Amino acid sequence: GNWVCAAKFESNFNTQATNRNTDGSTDYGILQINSRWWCNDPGSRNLCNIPCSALLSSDITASVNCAKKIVS
Amino acid sequence: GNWVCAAKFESNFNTQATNRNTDGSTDYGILQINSRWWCNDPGSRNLCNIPCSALLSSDITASVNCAKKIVS
Amino acid sequence: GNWVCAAKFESNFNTQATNRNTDGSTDYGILQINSRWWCNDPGSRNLCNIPCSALLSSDITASVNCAKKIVS
Amino acid sequence: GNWVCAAKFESNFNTQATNRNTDGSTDYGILQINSRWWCNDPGSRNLCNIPCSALLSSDITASVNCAKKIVS
Amino acid sequence: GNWVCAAKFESNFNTQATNRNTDGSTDYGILQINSRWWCNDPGSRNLCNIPCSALLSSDITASVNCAKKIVS
C-alpha cells in the first residue's frame, strides 16, 4: 500500500492581513529511513554523527541549524 | 505501492496583504535514505559526520546552516 | 510503484500585495540516497564529512550555508 | 516505476504587487545519490569533504554558500 | 521507468508589478550522482574536497559561492 512520510502540507485560502515570522526554527532536522519492498532476502545502515568537542573554549556549536541574532 | 517522502507542499489562493519573514530556519537539514524494491538479495550505507573541534577558541560553528545577524 | 522524494512544490494564485523575505534559511541542506530496483544481487556508499578545526581562533564556520548580516 | 527526486516546482498565477527577497538562503546544498535499476550484480561511492582548519586565525569559512552583507 | 532529478521548474502567468531580489543564495551547490541501468556486473566514484586552511590569517573563504556586499 501507498505511503506518505514526513511530508509537510500547507494551504492558505482567502487569507488577509497576515504576518508570518520565524527565527531559528527547524523541521525534520535529521531524517533517516530504510525501506525494502517485495524483497527476497547484510542490511542497509545509516549513521549520523554530530560531535562537538570544546576545550578551554567558548560559544561553539555543532548543529543542523544555528541562528544568532541581535536587535537594538 | 507509491511513496511520498519529505515532500514540502505549499498552496496560496486569493491571499492578500501578506508578509512572510524567515531568519535562520531549516527544513530537512540532514536526510538519509536507503531503498530496495523488487530485489532478490553487503548493504548500502550512508554516513554523515559534522565534527567541530575548537580549542582555546571562540564563536566557532560546524553546521548545516549558520546565520549571524545584527540590526540597529 | 512511483516515488516522490524531497520535492518542493509551491503554488500561488490570485495573490496580491505580498512580501516574502528570507535570511539564511536552508532546505534539504544535506541529502543522501541509495536506491536499487528490480535488482538481482558490495553495496553503494555515500559519505559526507564537514569538519571544523579551530585553535586559538575566532568566528570560524564550516557549513553548508553561512550568512552574516549587519544593518544600521 | 517513475521517480521524482529533489525537484523544485514553483507556479505563480494572476499574481500582483509582489516582492520576493532572499539573502544567503540555500537549497539542496549537498546532494548525493546512488541508483541501480534492472541490474544483475564493488559498489558506487560518493564522498564529500568540507574541512575547515583555522589556527590563530579569524573569520574563516569553508562552505557551500557564504554571504556577508553590510547595510547603513 | 523515467526519472526527474534536481530539476528546477518555474512558471509565471499574468504576473504584474513584481520584484524578485536575490543576494548570495545557492541551489544544488554540490550535486553527485552515480547511476547504472540494465547492467550485468570496480564501481564509479565521486570525490569532492573543499579544504580551507588558514593560519594567522583573516577573512579567508573556500566555497562554491561567496558574496560580499556593502551598501551606504
Residue numbers in the entry:
A (entry chain A), B (entry chain C), C (entry chain E), D (entry chain G), E (entry chain I): 26 to 66, 70 to 100
Sentences from the study reporting this entry:
Here we go beyond the mesoscopic polymorphisms of amyloids from human lysozyme and HEWL, providing unprecedented evidence at the atomic level for the different folding motifs in the irreversible and reversible amyloids derived from a single protein sequence, by combining atomic force microscopy (AFM), cryo-electron microscopy (cryo-EM) and solid-state NMR. By combining atomic force microscopy, cryo-electron microscopy and solid-state NMR, we show that a full unfolding of the native protein precursor is a requirement for establishing irreversible amyloid fibrils. In contrast, under the longer heat-treatment in the presence of a reducing agent, native lysozyme undergoes a complete unfolding, which allows it to fold into irreversible fibrils, with twelve and ten in-register inter-molecular β-sheets for human lysozyme and HEWL, respectively.
We also report the structure of hen egg-white lysozyme irreversible amyloids at 3.2 Å resolution, revealing another canonical amyloid fold, and reaffirming that irreversible amyloids undergo a complete conversion of the native protein into the cross-β structure. Following a similar strategy, we also solved the structure of the irreversible fibrils of HEWL that were prepared under the same conditions as the human lysozyme fibrils. In details, the HEWL amyloid fibril structure comprises residues 26-101 and is composed of 11 inter-molecular in-register β-sheets (β1: residues 28-30, β2: 33-38, β3: 43-45, β4: 51-52, β5: 55-62, β6: 73-76, β7: 80-83, β8: 89-92, β9: 93-98 and two β-strands, of 6 and 4 residues with unknown sequence composition). The β-strands are sometimes bordered by Gly residues (i.e., Gly26, Gly49, Gly54, Gly71, Gly102), by prolines (i.e., Pro79) or β-arches. There are asparagine ladders (such as the buried Asn37, Asn59, Asn74, and Asn77 [which is buried because there is another undefined β-strand close by as highlighted in Fig. 3f]). Neither their overall folds, the sequence locations of the β-strands, nor the core hydrophobic and charged interactions are similar. While the 3D structure of the irreversible HEWL amyloid fibril structure is largely distinct from its human analog both at the secondary structure level as well as the side chain interface between the secondary structures, once again the two sub-domains of the native fold are intertwined in the amyloid structure with the anti-parallel β-sheet segment of sub-domain B forming partially the core of the fibril structure surrounded and complemented by segments from the helical sub-domain A of the native fold.
